[PDB]
Design an enzyme around this catalytic site. Structure first.
Site: not given
Ligand SMILES: Nc1nc2c(ncn2[C@@H]2O[C@H](COP(=O)(O)OP(=O)(O)OP(=O)(O)O)[C@@H](O)[C@H]2O)c(=O)[nH]1
Ligand SMILES: [Mg+2]
Lengths: 1122, 437
Positions: B140, B143-144, B179, B254
């Site tokens: 994602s 976050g780090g 967050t 593909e």
């Protein structure tokens, strides 16, 4: 401090004990007062030696009285302890009583002590030490007891028995009393009778304590440390024939205790201590048949030098030194050889500290033999240069300290003829270190060793001469040792090549940038004392280091090369000869390949790219300032490029080194243009002059900000001969950036740099009356002044704050640089209106609220006013300003401090031309947010208003100026709230008390309308509060203004925000309580009750009725919904 | 045959991976302990489900996954979870310190110590496979450890295995699920870093899935479990083509030829239908033309945008369950006679359709219901550019003040990274505007 100049105070504090021992606040105050008085002599307590006795006796006649309560006795013992930490116990206990009538009075006091009382630990500490100073009595403890069978049924316990039961109990405590228990036994078991009576019992107790205790259980570790300390003290202060019998069992138990592997630093230190205490019990003391336990002791003490802590390494070194001094001359060689093994390649730096400490301890006694000179010395030469980097930290300080200690111990370890062979390698080491060492402790450590060597021996080349200059205080500043004392030491031929070699080898390859710069600046001066050696030996060396893979080494070598080239050029400039006489073809050939070898390895990227760019720019500047022979060669075209790219990638440089990079690039460009871009004397190259100028001008429009900032200063650094017919274009290009466009709103640094660039260009070309595109003339002088004044109103406020202020700074230093120039050439150009506007703007920027910009503005004003050669013409009230700011007082003024600036700036209101601007500037400070600034500005304003309050004319003009300022800044959010707060303060102070006499004054009649128009449809809470306060202060003016203010105050009472509703009523209450003539006494007890009972923070519909009711009392028409 | 490896980094990543593996085991019938009663070729061989499960001597089907995290807290739940016997202990990698929502830390400080172990584990896991296709990474941007370490691992996988695809399943953050305030700062960095080391990227707007769970699934306050289940359903509907020998999208290479006509543009739009609640198990019935008309709805997409303005570059429909070709043709004719749509005429790709005759599946006891047919549409569109216009905007809101930027520079990276990243964003926006015409 020569003597104790606080005798009366201490005497009074001590006497007050008898009437402050029942207090809890006064007791602590007196304690804290006694502590701060005694701490002043913590660095030299010997000065208090003459006083010790009297103060001690004072504290003693309070704890030695029978009518003394426990609490009073506890304060005296706390004071006594305060005098024993500063002077120390070893020296302060020698004065305590020691008469035979002090053996039972002190033991009986020791028997009424609460061991569980942590608050009275000083009492127990002072008790044990006193009991120990009483065991010196030269009599048997038996003679004192007398007859023990006098009490039938229960016999009394002997004094010696009681002391043995006191020491064993205090040796297992967790407070500081255990340390006092270590000093007691040392003077209890070391006497004849106790030795024959309780020595075996105490030894069994200790051997049981070290046979059951652990280094994990807390109380177990407490039992271990105390027992080890007691054993060490006993073996130190104990007879050798009464102790040697027990040395075999003590070591056998310590070996089984396993101390080296335990995880305690104090336990290991005490263990090594006890091991070295037992080691000397086997040998005979010497004054300059080897049992088997000595070998085991040496094997333990030679493993205590590789410890992880220095506290244990020092103890191990002391033990090794004390053992070597007692052993024969044969085992001394083996011990020295075994200790020298610590300096192996596999050994860490921690092992080197212990080895050097042991070597110093051995040399102090004079045990090292001559045969150990070629080896030991060979190691010291390295220990003095130990400076490594272990990841992110550095190590080598303690190593150099121990090396200096060993050097200081060689002035008494060998004869003058015994050490005659190494006076050329050790004198060079000492001097080199004391001169270039990083740490100040090492430098002074090398300074003391050299002093001791030249004092005791005196065989070092120029010992007295080097000691007189490089003394203890002379080597305090590191900068002084690298640029001054270094040259003085190099003046002699014995400290020239070694120092230069040490600088070029290690210091140039250092990890710290400041150290590298200092070494380069030192080599710059050192090259003067040795030009041939620096041009034939150092230059090839540094040239080879510029091709190193190491980044820091490359930077250092480049800096050294640049500095040496500059020094050679300066030296040659004296005899009027070219710089090529020193550097050879190969040397000048390698100075034309540094940049092409960096750009071809892509060494300008990453974190080291900025450092490489800085180094190459410094080198290019130093080469261009020397007039090197690179004219016509393509290498020049390279250097120039490397500059442009920098100005194109300034945003890539870190935020902590971009200004320095830009300045260095600009300086290099300036040095290059005034050396390699000149076609003829007075002319320049047409092709370069055109291409560079077109490129720079077209670059000014790049949307990037840092690029414009760099190119501005670049334009501001070009010489004068390159702008002989292109000024009309450069000035226009610079002014095009100084303007604030819709896209360049937050672009303030660009204009800040453009102003500085225009200053420099105007200063270089000078004034020539007639030549517009060549110099500043009466045709292109007005445009310049208009562009500079258009950047003085830069109040741009963003999420970064008031960044526009920065630009204003550039407008104060620029406008000055221009004015001072005209007065020094064509003063007629300084028009009257322009000078007046500049002065008024400087006045406004010196009456601001920020403290660093305000201080800069006052200095600029003083510099512009104190100009007499020639005097700047057209100065409003020049004499008035000069009398207000005399040259004698300006020498000491804290303009940055509002207190020492506002009272001096408020006096400018007296002058009409300044009265308006000065007030517009001071309004921001009078209505800002800073509390100190607000207070100072209000005080300075009232101090000036008091002089013109009873004058209808002066007060009227002041009010008119204030209202004109308010109108000019109508609907201005940056001037609306501050000016409203200033008006509120002025009204609360009662300055306009004269206009309140008549009715309907021209002042308030329009001030109220202006305030209404300002607060009409306002959502800001601060603005609403300011308006409410202004409308609650303006009630003092009678007439229709009072009724209008009351109607506004009723309108505001019913606002959308309940907070405003409550604040309006709270302020109206105070306003009514202040002015009583506003409302009669017939309807005054009807307003306060309605304001106190009605909840203005409740339903607004319900409060409308109460508010409407307060409109039928005040007599205010009741408004309706339009 | 060829298998695949899925690396799950971060908290959201490992959660999505666990949900996907649970759904896969429930669909294939593999029990928690790893016992497939339907499998007969023990020891090893070649099957449709063999592309994501390795067979051992005892018949255990170990998932071909690598769950890595910089904190032991998250991996402890997996180690002590019901599926502890499914994954191998070595496949779970833990760390002692986290990134504290920082890209520089996850890409330099903490990443330099775990990247070597991650690469060694990936190499050990790939040694058993005879032919690898790519690396399905899950992370994602809020976050780090999901941006920094993901980019650091992509940089090494682009060098170790350059002839292998690199698909991603990013999660576009939201201001309601955010967050940290430096959440964007991480996003831009990792986005700029994986541009040349990723063929196709799948982004999940947190607000979109939150609204879907609130409306469709009918939840008062959808939690992270509710959003991890829907992402697992999406991943299963997308990977059915590789897990069931589907005709369309047989391999990973593909996906770049069907949904990525341009290298720089690799952010397709994925939508899925239907979304029935557990309570309404048998309330209404949706035809093959009522679920294919629900995938052309902005509120039904995973990212909030307006495709009606822009034009589509590609389009791939995937049906799963009882679906007859006649129904698909009828739905296509309905979509082609009802909705107005624009398409790039000079694009080297067009519309494609595939079917998978397998019954849907849902986690028992959950909030979802078992449907009779499902549809998943993957279509690249210029409207996704809008999703960027927001992100970049926030960056500017944090660039004029340079707040929280020194924390990223005081860990490894320099200052030019931000200018490069925002310069990469400007070029992407220009390319999007050019493709949109
Ligand atoms: N859809 C979804 N988003 C999640 C989940 N967990 C976290 N997020 C989002 O991911 C971002 C936080 O990143 P995390 O994965 O928690 O943190 P990390 O990437 O492991 O990194 P560090 O905190 O630096 O160690 C925010 O935008 C969260 O809303 C999850 O289970 N599902
Ligand atoms: Mg995490």
């Amino acid at each position: 401090l020569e003597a104790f100049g606080e005798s009366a105070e201490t005497r009074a504090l001590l006497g007050r004990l008898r009437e402050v021992h029942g207090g809890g606040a006064e007791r602590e105050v007196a304690l804290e007062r006694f502590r701060v008085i005694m701490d002043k002599y913590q660095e030299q307590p010997h000065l208090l030696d003459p006083h010790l006795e009297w103060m001690m006796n004072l504290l003693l006649d309070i704890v030695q009285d029978q009518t003394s309560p426990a609490s009073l006795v506890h304060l005296a013992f706390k004071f006594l302890y305060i005098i024993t930490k500063v002077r120390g116990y070893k020296t302060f206990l020698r004065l305590f009583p020691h008469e035979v009538a002090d053996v039972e009075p002190v033991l009986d006091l020791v028997t009424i002590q609460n061991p569980k009382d942590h608050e009275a630990w000083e009492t127990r500490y002072m008790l044990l030490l006193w009991l120990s100073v009483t065991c010196l009595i030269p009599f048997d403890f038996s003679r004192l007891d007398g007859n023990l069978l006098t009490q039938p049924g229960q016999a009394r316990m002997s004094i010696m028995d009681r002391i043995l039961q006191i020491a064993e109990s205090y040796l297992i405590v967790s407070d500081k009393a255990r340390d006092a228990a270590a000093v007691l036994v040392s003077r209890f078991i070391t006497r004849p009778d106790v030795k024959q009576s309780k020595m075996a019992e105490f030894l069994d107790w200790s051997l049981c304590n070290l046979a059951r205790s652990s280094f994990q259980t807390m109380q177990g570790v407490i039992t271990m440390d105390g027992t080890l300390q007691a054993l060490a003290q006993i073996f130190k202060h104990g007879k050798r024939e009464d102790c040697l019998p027990y040395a075999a069992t003590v070591l056998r138990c310590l070996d089984g205790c396993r101390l080296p592997e335990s995880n305690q630093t104090l336990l290991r230190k005490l263990g090594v201590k006890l091991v070295q205490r037992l080691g000397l019990t086997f040998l005979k003391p010497k004054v300059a048949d080897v049992p088997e336990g000595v070998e085991r002791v040496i094997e333990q003490l030679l493993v205590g030098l590789k410890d992880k802590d220095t506290v244990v390494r020092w103890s191990a070194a002391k033990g090794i030194g004390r053992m070597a001094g007692r052993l024969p001359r044969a085992l001394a060689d083996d011990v020295v050889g075994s200790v020298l093994d610590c300096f192996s390649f596999q050994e860490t730096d921690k092992a080197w500290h212990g080895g050097c400490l042991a070597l110093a301890e051995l040399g102090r006694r004079g045990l090292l033999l001559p045969s150990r000179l070629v080896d030991v010395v060979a190691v010291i030469l390295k220990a003095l240069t130990y400076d490594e980097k272990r990841g992110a930290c550095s190590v080598g300080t303690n190593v150099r300290d121990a090396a200096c200690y060993v050097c200081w111990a060689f002035a008494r370890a060998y004869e003058p003829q015994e050490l005659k062979p190494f006076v050329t390698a050790i004198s060079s080491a000492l001097v080199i270190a004391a001169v270039f060492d990083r740490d100040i402790n090492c430098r002074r450590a090398a300074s003391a060793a050299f002093q001791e060597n030249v004092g005791r021996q005196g065989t070092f080349p120029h010992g007295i001469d080097i000691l007189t200059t490089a003394d203890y205080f002379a080597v305090g500043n590191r900068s002084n040792c690298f640029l001054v004392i270094s040259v003085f030491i190099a003046g002699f031929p014995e400290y020239t090549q070694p120092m230069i070699d040490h600088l070029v080898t290690m210091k140039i390859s250092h990890w710290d940038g400041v150290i590298r710069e200092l070494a380069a600046r030192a080599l710059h001066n050192l090259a003067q004392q040795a030009p041939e050696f620096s041009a034939t030996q150092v230059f090839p060396r540094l040239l080879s280091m510029t091709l190193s893979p190491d980044l820091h080494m490359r930077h250092g070598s480049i800096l050294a090369c640049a500095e040496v080239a500059y020094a050679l050029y300066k030296l040659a400039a004296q005899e009027n000869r070219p710089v090529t006489d020193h550097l050879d073809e190969q040397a000048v050939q390698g100075l034309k390949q540094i940049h092409q070898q960096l750009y071809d390895r892509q060494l300008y990227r990453g974190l080291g790219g900025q450092l490489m760019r800085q180094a190459v720019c410094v080198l290019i500047e130093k080469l261009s300032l020397s007039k090197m022979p690179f004219r016509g060669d393509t290498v020049i075209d390279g250097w120039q490029w490397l500059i442009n790219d920098t100005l194109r990638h300034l945003h890539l440089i870190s935020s902590h080194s971009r200004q320095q990079m830009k300045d260095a690039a600009v300086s290099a460009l300036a040095a290059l243009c005034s050396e390699y871009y000149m076609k003829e004397p007075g002319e320049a190259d047409p092709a370069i002059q055109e291409e560079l100028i077109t490129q720079y001008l077209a670059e000014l429009r790049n949307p990037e900000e840092m690029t414009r900032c760099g190119f501005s200063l670049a334009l501001g650094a070009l010489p004068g001969f390159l702008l002989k017919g292109r000024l009309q274009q450069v000035l226009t290009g610079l002014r095009a950036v100084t303007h604030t466009s819709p896209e360049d709103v937050s672009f303030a640094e660009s204009r800040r740099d453009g102003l500085k660039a225009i200053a420099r260009i105007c200063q270089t070309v000078g004034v020539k009356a007639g030549a517009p595109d060549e110099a500043v003339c009466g045709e292109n002088v007005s445009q310049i002044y208009c562009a500079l004044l258009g950047c003085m109103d830069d109040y741009t406020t963003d999420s970064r704050g008031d960044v526009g202020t920065w630009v204003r700074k550039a407008a104060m230093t620029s406008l000055m640089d221009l004015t001072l120039l005209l007065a020094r050439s064509q003063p007629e150009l300084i028009e009257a209106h322009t000078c007046e506007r500049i002065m008024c703007c400087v006045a406004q920027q010196a009456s601001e609220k920020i403290d660093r910009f305000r201080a800069h503005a006052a200095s600029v004003f003083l510099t512009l006013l104190h100009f007499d050669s020639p005097p700047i013409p057209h100065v409003p009230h020049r004499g008035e300003l000069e009398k207000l700011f005399p040259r004698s007082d300006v020498a000491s003024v804290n303009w940055s401090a509002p207190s020492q600036a506002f009272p001096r700036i408020t006096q400018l209101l007296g002058l009409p031309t300044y009265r308006y601007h000065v007030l517009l500037g001071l309004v921001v400070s009078l209505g800002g947010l800073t509390e100190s600034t607000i207070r100072h500005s209000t005080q300075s304003l009232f101090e000036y208003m008091k002089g013109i309050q009873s004058d209808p004319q002066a007060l009227g003009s002041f009010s008119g100026t204030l209202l004109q300022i308010f109108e000019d800044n109508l609907l201005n959010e940056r001037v609306s709230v501050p000016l409203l707060k200033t008006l509120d303060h002025v009204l609360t102070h009662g300055c306009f008390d004269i206009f309140t006499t008549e009715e309907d004054h021209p002042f308030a009649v329009k001030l109220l309308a202006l305030c209404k128009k300002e607060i009409k449809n306002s959502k800001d809470i601060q603005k609403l509060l300011s308006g409410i306060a202004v409308f609650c202060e303006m009630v003092q003016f009678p007439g229709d203004v009072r009724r209008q203010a009351l109607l506004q105050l009723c309108l505001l009472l019913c606002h959308r925000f309940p907070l405003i509703r409550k604040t309006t009523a709270s302020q109206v209450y105070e306003t009514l309580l202040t002015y009583s003539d506003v409302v009669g006494a017939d309807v005054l007890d009807e307003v306060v009750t309605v304001l106190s009972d009605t909840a203005w923070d409740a339903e607004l519909a319900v409060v409308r009725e109460q508010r409407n009711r307060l409109c039928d009392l005040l007599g205010v028409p009741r408004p309706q919904l339009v | 045959m060829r298998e695949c490896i899925s690396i799950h980094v971060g908290q959201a990543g490992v959660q999505i991976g666990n949900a996907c593996w649970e759904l896969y085991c429930l669909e294939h019938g593999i029990q928690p302990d790893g016992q497939m009663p339907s499998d007969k070729t023990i020891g090893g061989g070649d099957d449709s489900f063999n592309t994501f499960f390795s067979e051992t001597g005892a018949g255990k089907h170990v998932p071909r996954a690598v769950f890595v995290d910089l904190e032991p807290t998250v991996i402890d739940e997996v180690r002590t979870g019901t599926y502890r016997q499914l994954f191998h202990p070595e496949q779970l990698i833990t760390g002692k310190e986290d990134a504290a929502n920082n890209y520089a830390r996850g890409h330099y400080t903490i990443g330099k110590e775990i990247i070597d172990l991650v690469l060694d584990r990936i190499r050990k896991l790939a040694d058993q496979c005879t032919g690898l296709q790519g690396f399905l990474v899950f992370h994602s941007f809020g976050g780090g450890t999901g941006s920094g370490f993901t980019s650091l691992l992509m940089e090494r996988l682009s060098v170790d295995y350059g002839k292998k695809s690199k698909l991603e399943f990013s999660i576009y953050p939201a201001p309601q699920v955010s967050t940290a305030v430096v959440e964007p700062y991480n996003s831009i960095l990792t986005t700029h870093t994986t541009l040349e080391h990723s063929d196709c990227a799948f982004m999940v707007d947190n607000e979109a899935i939150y609204d879907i769970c609130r409306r469709n699934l009918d939840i008062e306050r959808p939690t992270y479990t509710n959003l991890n289940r829907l992402i697992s359903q999406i991943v299963s509907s997308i990977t059915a083509s590789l897990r069931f020998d589907g005709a369309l999208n047989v391999d990973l290479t593909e996906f770049q030829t069907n949904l990525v006509p341009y290298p720089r543009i690799h952010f397709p739009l994925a939508t899925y239908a239907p979304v029935i609640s557990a309570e309404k198990a048998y309330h209404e019935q949706l035809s093959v033309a009522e679920i294919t008309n629900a995938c052309f709805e902005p509120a039904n997409q995973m990212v909030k945008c307006d495709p009606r303005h822009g034009k589509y570059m590609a389009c791939c429909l995937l049906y799963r369950g009882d679906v007859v070709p006649k129904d698909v043709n009828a739905a296509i004719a309905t979509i082609k006679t009802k909705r107005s749509i624009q398409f790039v005429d000079w694009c080297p790709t067009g519309f494609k359709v595939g079917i998978n005759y397998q019954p849907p599946t849902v986690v028992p006891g959950g909030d979802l219901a078992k449907v009779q047919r499902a549809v998943c549409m993957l279509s690249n569109t210029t409207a996704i550019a809008e999703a960027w216009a927001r992100l970049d905007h926030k960056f500017d809101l944090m660039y004029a003040k340079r707040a929280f930027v020194h924390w990223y520079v005081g860990e490894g990276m320099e200052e030019g990274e931000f200018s490069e990243a925002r310069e990469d964003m400007a070029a992407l926006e220009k390319d999007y505007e050019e493709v949109g015409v």
